[PDB]
Design a protein around this ligand. Structure first.
Ligand code: SF4
Length: 85
């Protein structure tokens, strides 16, 4: 089940960032952010994802832009940035 501090779709920051916990429902194709075909972009391959966040699970991870909350590994927002090694 989902953690109580999962980012909600109606959170003001979520709305400002165009976050969707399901990337397939997001505006990723239209946003065409660089580095990777948009249909492969998700929190899992984003520079801002923080896997060592409190409460992280296989599905729910931290994000630098959402302090104290958890995003969905399969989500996306308009700040998506390709993770560099
Ligand atoms: S910045 Fe990256 S990890 Fe955070 S919600 Fe947006 S796409 Fe997901």
């Amino acid at each position: 089940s989902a953690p109580a501090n999962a980012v909600a779709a109606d959170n003001a920051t979520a709305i400002a960032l165009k976050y969707n916990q399901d990337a397939t429902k997001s505006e990723r194709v239209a946003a065409a952010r660089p580095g990777l075909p948009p249909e492969e972009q998700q929190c899992a391959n984003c520079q801002f994802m923080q896997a060592d966040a409190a409460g992280a699970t296989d599905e729910w991870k931290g994000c630098q832009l959402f302090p104290g909350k958890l995003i969905n590994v399969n989500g996306w927002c308009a700040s998506w940035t390709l993770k560099a090694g």
